[PDB]
Design a protein around this ligand. Sequence first.
Ligand SMILES: *Cc1c(COP(=O)(O)O)cnc(C)c1O
Ligand SMILES: *Cc1c(COP(=O)(O)O)cnc(C)c1O
Lengths: 409, 409
Amino acid sequence: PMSKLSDSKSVFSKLSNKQIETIIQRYASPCFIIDENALLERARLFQQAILNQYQNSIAAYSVKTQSLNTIIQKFYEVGFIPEVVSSDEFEQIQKLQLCDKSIIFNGPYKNDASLIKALQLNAMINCDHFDEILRIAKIAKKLNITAKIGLRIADNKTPQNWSRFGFALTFTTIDKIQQIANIQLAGLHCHIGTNIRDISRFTAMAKNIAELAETILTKYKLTLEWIDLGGGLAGISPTLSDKRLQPYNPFDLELYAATIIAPLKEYLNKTNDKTKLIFELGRSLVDYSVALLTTIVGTREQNEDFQSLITDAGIHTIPTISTYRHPIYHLKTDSYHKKTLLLGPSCMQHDFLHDDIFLPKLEYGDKLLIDGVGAYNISRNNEFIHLKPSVILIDKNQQYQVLRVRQTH
Amino acid sequence: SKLSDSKSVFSKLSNKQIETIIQRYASPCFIIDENALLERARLFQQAILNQYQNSIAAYSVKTQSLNTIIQKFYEVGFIPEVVSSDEFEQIQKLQLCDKSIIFNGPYKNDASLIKALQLNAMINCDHFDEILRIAKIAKKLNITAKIGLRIADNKTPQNWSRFGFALTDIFTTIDKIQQIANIQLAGLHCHIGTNIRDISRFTAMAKNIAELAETILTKYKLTLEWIDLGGGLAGISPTLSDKRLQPYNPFDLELYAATIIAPLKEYLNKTNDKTKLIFELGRSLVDYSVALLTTIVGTREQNEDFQSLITDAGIHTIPTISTYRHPIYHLKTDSYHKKTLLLGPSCMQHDFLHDDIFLPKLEYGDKLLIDGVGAYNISRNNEFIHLKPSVILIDKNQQYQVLRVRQTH
Ligand SMILES: *Cc1c(COP(=O)(O)O)cnc(C)c1O
Ligand SMILES: *Cc1c(COP(=O)(O)O)cnc(C)c1O
């Protein structure tokens, strides 16, 4: 019964048919829309959650999840430190000419130029393979300075967190590091997956990371400068295999912060709260503040009990629709719903938004709102068949601000 | 295994040439061999023309949408074939002397239709309500629109499809079209799938289309103006579900042409060869003339029975790698191979170029060439994590031409 946008729990339930028509008139269909108020409320509440649990906590902005410059700026304005996983992302942040050049540099591939600038700005660099530690050392001699680094750890003692990415925690690697000159171990990094709703996995990882920081404490007389627990917390959209049809409530960030931090408080207290605790939540912060407006542009079948419709948005506009049941809302005053097949604007057999959803009868020109698409869609748009659609911010004054102009030939 | 001993059109490519390409345009880097590409194009036109004089090769824009490549095929005699309003507009911006164009696809917006109806384009509709939108536009212009009907060859088991009018009461659809003012049936369009290696599916479709064209001629005394047989012929790369690991030879176009045309010559001669016969092959024409140069940038494991390496290109640079076993060649000199895992420059579980290929031991700075990437990769590049790489044309003269500049922030 919450099929209708105005009757939903969506951030965008406030949007009338008239407002949607105006957005599309100005910026064309399909159109991404981002609500600034909801987005920055979530950002600030996350900072409160972690700081209430540990006062030397730092929220880092996961650029890859939502890489629009304007959004990065706004999270930076409330105290987030940019976190990048590539040299391009690293240089994106530099071009923003931010006053505070603090930055977290992750990723399996950091080119030489990126690592030079990073060292000059004393970024926090977390390495996940050995050859990179060596390349940083040679740079750390040419550049007459010692380089602090962190090590990405794989929580391979936890079955659900096992990963080939990072040094496995199942030590020989740290013995080598300290005989290495110009390199000084300064932190740990661990990122165990994505869309994690079983926060037992965060407890497990935090316990093993704490045991590691304790063993590093004794076998090496070293207190870590930072512990980065990555991201991975679940968003609001159920997976397609999930039996739940309705979206989840945005995950309780106080529950997340208390669960993951609890196994680490013992170590952090010995360090007199000088070890920084870093969090890199992306999806769970940004997903539900972004929706896609799409228009029905054709009909293949239309009978009492079934309709097959063509939309102007498909899997090349929101690729994560192939993995998640993103909520789909309509604008009709109509009680009778029928099985509905929503096809994208491609005659490719995998380009559909949903094959088993119940919606009222729709026709050419009707609009749908696809909610919870704020993570890992916009920046994956491409120029295949259809050019990239507009991205609009509903700013904190309820005024539209274009963040990406619709592409044209 | 090694590039020099390969059957690849880049077999001829030197380490110094490759290192020059990368030094000049960075890694990863797409390369397109002009000679191989246009030779394939001419052979296809020659194949279909020797079977039927009024055969027209159409260029599948979506398969390889770089403007320069489009212009080349246009100069060889190909007519542009588009499947979206954006592609349509891309072609008009080329300002070709001959405005002939094929307009396919499930979504054609009003602006493109108004333009296409007044440029004598062959417009193939796949759902009825598009027909009615054309009819109403045509009435505003006081013209009668000639349209083609996309047909689903649902009598052939492998060709069953939702896209197009079902050929299995199809005549109930053309009966309705006969009554609609400002519309006249003029052509048929059939596109039965992709990466089709069983040409029995083409011969079956051509026979069914021939029968439909005969019935139309007898029921409505109507001789069709064109028959569009679509594309879909297979490329050189096996699927990952394929048991075979080595690339196939480029499919025999003479065989394809002779077999798909033969069921239609009774009709086409009955028409004194005035029906135009259009072909829209893409993958099979362009895939093997394009390769991706990638560089090893790190190591995770290195035994003599197994190695796990990090490349600077992944599924976001060549997304068809998740579906196809694209040939991967090295430039070294060594007999000894080992199970090799090639990890993309992302720490996502699914970002790997190949997880059980045997390759010589490779190290940081070593280079690989992934062949057969010319279909459905370049235009799907995006700005997620890594910006888009350069695309380089290897001229007729073996000189380098920049078709897409490396992207930077
Ligand atoms: C993906 C990722 C994140 C964010 O992950 P989410 O699921 O969106 O929360 C943070 N840090 C790193 C290193 C990552 O790879
Ligand atoms: C995809 C497509 C083509 C090209 O298909 P290929 O497999 O690359 O040969 C031609 N015409 C239409 C309508 C298409 O959708």
